[PDB]
């Protein structure tokens, strides 16, 4: 799913100057950054664990990538040195917006990984209580007095959930939508199962 930057040797067999090697690459490498730029504005976090898990995987690998990406932005940074009159000008040009916006995605990339992190606790999380709940439909539904002290118990853990959803939200997460999504069901289900007791 990721192109690797290309390496200055694979240039030799053609034949071209040291610098006007260079500049091919500064440009593959300001190509590369757009083309993981689009993928990432592009990512999408994932409605249901199974989809979490996946998107977060993908995730890990685009990260990595643009992190092993460093060793080629060191080498155009370095690059600079080799380069001359008339196309150093140029060059500089392309290493600086380089710079930058190799600087966006990568925090992007961050952004986004420490999102599909909180995202992948949450929805853990709010599985693991639905899982419950519906279980409990079961259960109680089929003492008395150990029963009402479980769920006791159940609320704080719920009531728990909810305070990190509470949270996520406030800090606006993008994927507000399905963080929404499980927190309600989760309530409802734990508005249900404790009336059925009553």
């Given at each position: 799913?990721?192109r690797k930057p290309l390496?200055?040797?694979?240039?030799?067999?053609?034949?071209?100057?040291?610098?006007?090697?260079?500049?091919?690459?500064?440009?593959?490498?300001?190509?590369?950054?757009?083309?993981?730029?689009?993928?990432?504005?592009?990512?999408?976090?994932?409605?249901?664990?199974?989809?979490?898990?996946?998107?977060?995987?993908?995730?890990?690998?685009?990260?990595?990538?643009?992190?092993?990406?460093?060793?080629?932005?060191?080498?155009?940074?370095?690059?600079?040195?080799?380069?001359?009159?008339?196309?150093?000008?140029?060059?500089?040009?392309?290493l600086h917006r380089l710079?930058?916006?190799?600087?966006?995605?990568?925090?992007?990339?961050?952004?986004?990984?420490?999102?599909?992190?909180?995202?992948?606790?949450?929805?853990?999380?709010?599985?693991?209580?639905?899982?419950?709940?519906?279980?409990?439909?079961?259960?109680?539904?089929?003492?008395?007095?150990?029963?009402?002290?479980?769920?006791?118990?159940?609320?704080?853990?719920?009531?728990?959930?909810?305070?990190?959803?509470?949270?996520?939200?406030?800090?606006?997460?993008?994927?507000?939508?399905?963080?929404?999504?499980?927190?309600?069901?989760?309530?409802?289900?734990?508005?249900?199962?404790?009336?059925?007791?009553?």
């Amino acid at each position: 799913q990721i192109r690797k930057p290309l390496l200055k040797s694979s240039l030799l067999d053609q034949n071209l100057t040291e610098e006007e090697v260079n500049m091919k690459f500064v440009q593959d490498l300001l190509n590369w950054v757009d083309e993981m730029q689009v993928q990432l504005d592009r990512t999408e976090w994932g409605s249901d664990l199974p989809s979490v898990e996946s998107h977060l995987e993908n995730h890990k690998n685009v990260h990595r990538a643009i992190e092993e990406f460093e060793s080629s932005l060191k080498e155009a940074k370095i690059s600079e040195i080799q380069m001359t009159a008339p196309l150093k000008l140029s060059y500089t040009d392309k290493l600086h917006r380089l710079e930058s916006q190799y600087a966006k995605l990568l925090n992007t990339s961050r952004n986004q990984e420490r999102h599909l992190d909180t995202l992948h606790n949450f929805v853990t999380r709010a599985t693991n209580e639905l899982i419950w709940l519906n279980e409990k439909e079961e259960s109680e539904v089929a003492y008395h007095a150990e029963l009402m002290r479980e769920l006791e118990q159940k609320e704080e853990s719920i009531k728990a959930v909810q305070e990190i959803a509470e949270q996520l939200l406030l800090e606006n997460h993008p994927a507000r939508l399905t963080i929404e999504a499980y927190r309600a069901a989760m309530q409802t289900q734990w508005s249900w199962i404790l009336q059925l007791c009553q």
